[PDB]
Design a protein around this nucleic acid. Structure first.
Ligand SMILES: C[S@@+](CC[C@H](N)C(=O)[O-])C[C@H]1O[C@@H](n2cnc3c(N)ncnc32)[C@H](O)[C@@H]1O
Ligand SMILES: C[S@@+](CC[C@H](N)C(=O)[O-])C[C@H]1O[C@@H](n2cnc3c(N)ncnc32)[C@H](O)[C@@H]1O
Lengths: 92, 76, 99, 108, 83, 326, 88, 98, 93, 108, 328, 76
DNA sequence: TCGGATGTATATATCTGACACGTGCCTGGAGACTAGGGAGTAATCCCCTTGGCGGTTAAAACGCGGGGGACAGCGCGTACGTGCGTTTAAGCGGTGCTAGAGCTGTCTACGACCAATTGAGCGGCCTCGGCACCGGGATTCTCGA
DNA sequence: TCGAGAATCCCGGTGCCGAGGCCGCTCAATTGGTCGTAGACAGCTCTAGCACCGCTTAAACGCACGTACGCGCTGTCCCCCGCGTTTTAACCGCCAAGGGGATTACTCCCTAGTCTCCAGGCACGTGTCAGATATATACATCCGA
């Protein structure tokens, strides 16, 4: 029983381009993309908690790993997107 | 009566059946004697893909019929 | 009367031909034999999923295409149009492969 | 007891917070994982996948198609300046290359 | 059963075709033996790493993930085969 | 043992104590009084020729009797042209806003008497919203000449610091009332002295300013939700506030009326904002963002030009969207 | 008074013309065009502004106001430039 | 009077500095450069003195390695003087000019 | 508190190889940076092999193949023989 | 009870097996660490440090010194072909560069 | 319905059954008998002219009566020069070692009759010491001409495979007795047929070989510790043995006497071995390692040239070390 | 009697001592009243670096003497 | 090829502060034991890798020609090196100051763990529309006049 | 320049298979508690980062001159591009066989965790030698002749 991000990539695509599909070969590339930047961010957040003698990865380690890894204006809009999610999560 | 349930591997058994038995009851008795889970089993009856809702009598299925077991698995 | 193009016309037509497509440019069965004889250096019986030979080919295409892009810049730098073997050697030197 | 509501819905996300949380605990990254850490990470992964599918759907429209092909992902990444910095060491299968001819090579 | 002289299967038209996706419009005749030598050094390094991943998994078949893992630890990461 | 001036309109003029307290290591409140004279020497285009014989770029300014000079010709020799007040002439009507030459001088002067120790402004928690920085006179002058405040606008500086930004806007704009809020107690303590010293040096030249108020408190409070929405133009210096307190301000700005101007260091909306079904609730839906012209020496913490942004609220972008939905 | 920060202004000049030569002499170059010195101050301004900013933000994450020798190592070693001798 | 031909003393300076390991940039002009790039972060920063030496050891190693690749791009064009298009060609092949 | 380095152990190896030479304290700090760097490369690669093969333990089989992945040609050949010679002596004692 | 004998001595090593074992358990590499895994790793680290100190002591002798300087580590690494492949992305502080002049630049 | 030959010295000659069993898809035991005749056609420099009229490079070899031809002139026409045995002539004295032309032919012939299914040799656990590979005739001929075996040496092939390496050494070297051990049961089963067929085709030509023995068993056993140390020259094909069973062999090789030759695929000692206080116990202390000249088609699993190594034990390197211990 | 134990910080106490007290007994009484561990304490007595083996009387130490506490720590 | 001159290696005095040795202590590594679960191993199943075969035709190879680009030589002018004299500011050393890194001690709130529940996501399934391919339509582009 | 001709875009048509939607059914995520320890926070200590002084002199700066190198131009010439045939073998579709990847079950042996114990390594003190420096002499390099 396998699993992938294919259900969730197809949901985001219908929000952006509501009448547009995606090839199964192109969906396999988007799974490789999400898995790449998962363990790219999570590997850097793991080193930040180890450099500072902590044992917990919090959303503050995730935030400054985004700023290290993403370039320029992607890092600005990924941080304002990630903090918007956390405030809606902890109020609701 | 009985039916001949042949597999794709060359294995033919004798499954003693009833007209009131559903396809779910057919897929429950093979595991009782062989051990194959019922999400892997299909019966070739003149090429028709059967459905677990109705019985054998609702498809003009004669006794001593040759049913070929199509073995599918849970993914690709 | 055998109408023929001037040299460089068909070559520029082939730049546009192959920078528009996405297909593999090496023949597949001669590439697969090259993979199976480099693996003869080990011993012995290796079996190579067909998806793995396609993954090696797609990576060897992208290596060589991106190496001819840097080779081309080294020939323009020397005010030439032909690429020459000393342009591949310079490009791999600065890239950190030839050393 | 109360009706089950997913962590993605109360965060307002499309990506799964509960699956991201499982992969952080499974992956040997730290001894312990905070509560808001998979919420923050799933929002960033959903943002970045919406940036590529934005640009790749625009490339699919310019070539008069209605599906996204690996060529359209390649054109989306290499034409955007900051997606080219992330994915600069990445090769995309059946993606091709950008059409680019050096101006010296053109006739006259 | 011994398989030999297979870089010559990478022909002169194939190398010329890779150069024109790279944007090269004129090619000297000595390019073709240089390109076969650069390609053999590249494939030998990736297959050496892909075969030592399938030693450790105790297999016989080199899978597509062994190639994706081998390319990833050379900085040449590759999408579309299961990474 | 002291020296004193006279107010050219009539008030309690100027007490300059003994030996010229420290403004820096090398100018030590010298060169400031002789530049104060040069602005009373205008508008009044009389003292350029009337004191042509006496004033100079002279030496010997470290003594006292030479500092008795250049004010004795102010404590006495201003009276020979002051005297003509009988019947036909009053000196000035008070309805004159200062030009950008002497308003720079008044704001530079009021800073020196008020901020006694500018290194105490550096006491903050690092990388926090309480880090301190100032905006130069040249950019606030640019900011006024881009927002074009009419007679019915309200100006609020969110995090006004010591408060020099609301003083320039209160002296160059005819609006009703201006506000500045400040949480941190060290620049809010200097803001009280800056408030007092501004009004007395602005009555000294006899120039008109608008009304203003410098307050303490947090703008992230329930009191400030209503009165952010009731103001026309907002200046905020959000360069190191962070993403959490910028996310808070984006949902206070969603209540402002039409034509709401917002000037900030970092933009609250991207410059190329595309609207789709994923960012409908965003603040960038309802505002247009342009970048102001960057000028040299714009901020106080660095030398390279930092450019600010202008936000203009018009809720028609979401009315030009929802016009292609079917 | 004046002022809360004294701003340092040019400081790339700084890296002087006889110091860009003698860096080119360890590189082994024999002759240098006159336009190299402005080109070599744009590079070293792009570099060393990417190392700082990634040295800070390791300092910010530690809440620490003083960028140490580590965080420069770890800034380098993140750009693929491991530095020995300071050091991890 | 005696006068060396041009190129003689330049080759003597190759041997002079490839033999030594000293820092080639002055230290106080470099430290002053570091502290004014750090002014772009608003807040006050301190720079432990071992961190300014780590940045200078890293910046000089970058520039020396960039002039080795620049020198190979000038020899490739049958020149002896290096030139700004050799730095630009070296940084594009290396992957930095983007 | 106190510290931990490899300076006791780098010095013992130096006295076995060149028993008459010494080492400065700035070259000793470069050898500590080297040992910590190669430790992180090998232990990081061996951690990644166990996750690929769905194992939860790092054994000496995975340290061995991480050495083959990371070290170049003849260095990888002699580091494997020095590693197996140590493990076989350890298991017999 | 029996006399304590270190794991480095029964392996025949100079590097500490017990400290390497602690750093593998501390470092979040896996859930579990085998018994011979720190023995194998400490032997490889001791081998590689003996290869550099072999070559750096030879460079220190050629320059007529009796101590090893960071220059001698730089000359040892860059003159050996396989140590240059490991440490090719590594800069050594106060290490300098190899003396190398291009043959075109030499007179006549 | 069959065909048969005659032994030119006198023994049970040759049974070649009907239709020429499969050696490959396209040569099918044809072309082999006509090359077998060409070596009896020499040394004996008589049949080159005596059958000049009849033998040819003719067509029509798929039939039977034409295969009755080219042996009827062997089952009958050899007798016209055989006949002269009376009184003054015996054909050959048995003390002749074959030249490298027909020994290649005898070893190629004995391989085809013995290994009936060469694809069964590929049944092994992968990347294990039991992987199979062969060494070509040209490299074993190089190996003999570099070790220079005297009259008092012992040869052991560790992991002899099917056993073709000890057969070439037993037919080109005058030593006492030669050994080959093999653990895996599939090439050890072909080694028994290879043993039988070698002796009968070597008596057929009337050529002399040394004595040899092909055995089963593990060379990592207690029996083989003593008899590794008692042999002068050792061949081992350790290309995919691995580091564990190479570490085992390095402490069996430490007991060999002086002038012990060891030939291997991968070297047991580095080519540039420096001795210091850290590697005194190593096996490279006591042996000199040289690389043999690489030749094309040297091994059986690949086409590129694999070069072997020569180890020579002399315990004087550790006696030229310990001669500088108190020089400074 | 008593001695004046001044620190580097400007803090001077009155430690009532005996001639038979060792330097270990001096370093044990400061922690009893201040709390500084005895691997951090030195006594300037005409510049001399004292040793924990002997007493105060074996150094010609007079009562009401000015001893300057040199504060070292456990590393650099 | 030869000669005056500057540079660089060789040799001797001399001196300091940094490396190497010794000592005391303490905390982290070793020894011994239990408990349980990860991985070894054996058995089974079926996907998928390998091999072969034949026909067709796309592509490779060598048919073979000539234009254009590489390369060498030459001449001119300018820009870079060398060197000398002046000027700036680095570097050293020293003192002084405080702030902030680093540490310790409480204590609390957050996260791991567990069990019960249940709905989202996965697998299988039919189906239709996008997309590929097609012939024949029109439009542009290169090249010799 | 303007026809001639080969390349390419453009416009309907056919068809086919892969995407996208439906449905049933887990099993993984969620809800609700408990527990204990990680980390937050306050308070303290004291190193080291910062600022400033004066002085000496090393290095930077500016200038001048000549020459060597860059660069533009010309000319030869050979090598690379191009297009039609007789040549090779890739590609495709098909069948066939069996190794080997993948799963499941049993179970044993290896590792985590515990407590106790103790000696190795770390800090501190110390002493002396190696290397930096200065000086003088000696030989290799450079450049005019
Ligand atoms: C960068 S200063 C700007 C000073 C002034 N606006 C100027 O430009 O001259 C920002 C100020 O905002 C203040 N601040 C930060 N957060 C605040 C809040 N939540 N409520 C009120 N003031 C706040 C801080 O004290 C800081 O002094
Ligand atoms: C590569 S084959 C060499 C065959 C033969 N030496 C040749 O070159 O023609 C190596 C053989 O050694 C055998 N082998 C491996 N380990 C062995 C052992 N421990 N004892 C005996 N034979 C062994 C294997 O069966 C394998 O067939």
């Amino acid at each position: 029983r396998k699993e992938s991000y294919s259900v969730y990539v197809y949901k985001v695509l219908k929000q952006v381009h509501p009448d547009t599909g995606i090839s199964s070969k192109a969906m396999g590339i988007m799974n490789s993309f999400v898995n790449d930047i998962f363990e790219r961010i999570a590997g850097e957040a793991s080193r930040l908690a180890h450099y500072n003698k902590r044992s917990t990865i919090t959303s503050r380690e995730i935030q400054t790993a985004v700023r290290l890894l993403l370039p320029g204006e992607l890092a600005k809009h990924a941080v304002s997107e990630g903090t918007k999610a956390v405030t809606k999560y902890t109020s609701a | 009566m009985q039916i001949f349930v042949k597999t794709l591997t060359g294995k033919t058994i004798t499954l003693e059946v009833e007209p009131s038995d559903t396809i779910e009851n057919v897929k429950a008795k093979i595991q009782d004697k062989e051990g194959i889970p019922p999400d892997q089993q299909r019966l070739i009856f003149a090429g028709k893909q059967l459905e677990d809702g109705r019985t054998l009598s609702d498809y003009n299925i004669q006794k001593e019929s040759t049913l070929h077991l199509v073995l599918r698995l849970r993914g690709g | 009367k055998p109408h023929r193009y001037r040299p460089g016309t068909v070559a520029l037509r082939e730049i546009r031909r192959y920078q528009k497509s996405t297909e593999l440019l090496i023949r597949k069965l001669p590439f697969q034999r090259l993979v199976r004889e480099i693996a003869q250096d080990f011993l012995t019986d290796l079996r190579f999923q067909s998806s793995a030979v396609m993954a090696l080919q797609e990576a060897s295409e992208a290596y060589l295409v991106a190496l001819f892009e840097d080779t081309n810049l080294c020939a323009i730098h020397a005010k030439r149009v032909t690429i020459m073997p000393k342009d591949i050697q310079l490009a791999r030197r600065i890239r950190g492969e030839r050393a | 007891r109360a009706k089950a509501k997913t962590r993605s819905s109360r965060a307002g996300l499309q990506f799964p917070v509960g699956r991201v949380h499982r992969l952080l605990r499974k992956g040997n990254y730290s001894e312990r994982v905070g509560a808001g850490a998979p919420v923050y990470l799933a929002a960033v992964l959903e943002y970045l996948t919406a940036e590529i599918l934005e640009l790749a759907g625009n490339a699919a429209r310019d070539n008069k198609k209605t599906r996204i092909i690996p060529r359209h992902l390649q054109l989306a990444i290499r034409n955007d300046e900051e997606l080219n910095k992330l994915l600069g060491r990445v090769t995309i299968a059946q993606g091709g290359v950008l059409p680019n001819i050096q101006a010296v090579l053109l006739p006259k | 059963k011994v398989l030999r002289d297979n870089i010559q299967g990478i022909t002169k038209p194939a190398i010329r075709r890779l150069a024109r996706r790279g944007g090269v419009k004129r090619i000297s005749g000595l390019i073709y033996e240089e390109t076969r030598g650069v390609l053999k050094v590249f494939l030998e390094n990736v297959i050496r790493d892909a075969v030592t991943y399938t030693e450790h998994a105790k297999r016989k078949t080199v899978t597509a993930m062994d190639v994706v893992y081998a390319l990833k630890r050379q900085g040449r990461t590759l999408y579309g085969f299961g990474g | 043992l002291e020296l004193r001036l006279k107010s050219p309109v009539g008030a309690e003029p100027a007490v300059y104590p003994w030996p010229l307290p420290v403004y820096d290591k090398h100018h030590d409140a010298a060169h400031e009084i002789i530049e104060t004279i040069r602005w009373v020497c205008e508008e009044i285009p009389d003292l350029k020729l009337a004191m042509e014989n006496y004033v100079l770029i002279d030496y010997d300014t470290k003594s006292f009797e030479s500092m008795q000079r250049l004010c004795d010709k102010y404590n006495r020799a201003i009276d020979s042209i002051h005297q003509l007040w009988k019947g036909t002439t009053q000196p000035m009507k008070l309805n004159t806003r200062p030009s950008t030459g002497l308003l720079r001088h008044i704001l530079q002067q009021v800073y020196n008497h008020s901020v006694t120790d500018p290194e105490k402004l550096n006491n903050y928690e690092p990388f926090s919203p309480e880090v301190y920085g100032e905006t130069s006179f040249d950019l606030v002058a640019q900011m006024i000449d881009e927002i074009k405040m009419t007679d019915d606008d309200l100006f609020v500086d969110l995090g006004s610091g010591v408060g020099q930004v609301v003083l320039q806007v209160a002296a160059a704009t005819n609006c009703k009332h201006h506000y500045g809020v400040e949480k941190a107690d060290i620049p809010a303590k200097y803001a009280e002295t800056m408030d007092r010293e501004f009004r007395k040096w602005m009555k000294w030249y006899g120039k008109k300013h608008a009304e203003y108020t410098l307050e303490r408190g947090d703008f992230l409070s329930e009191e400030w939700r209503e009165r952010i929405a009731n103001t026309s133009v907002i200046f905020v210096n959000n360069f190191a506030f962070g993403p959490e307190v910028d996310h808070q301000l984006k949902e206070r700005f969603a209540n402002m009326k039409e034509g709401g101007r917002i000037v900030s260091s970092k933009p609250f909306a991207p410059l190329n904002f595309r609207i789709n079904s994923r960012n409908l609730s965003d603040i960038g839906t309802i505002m247009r963002v342009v970048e102001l012209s960057p000028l040299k020496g714009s901020v106080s913490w660095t030398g390279k030009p930092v450019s600010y942004y202008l936000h203009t609220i018009d809720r028609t972008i979401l009315e030009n969207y929802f016009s292609s939905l079917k």
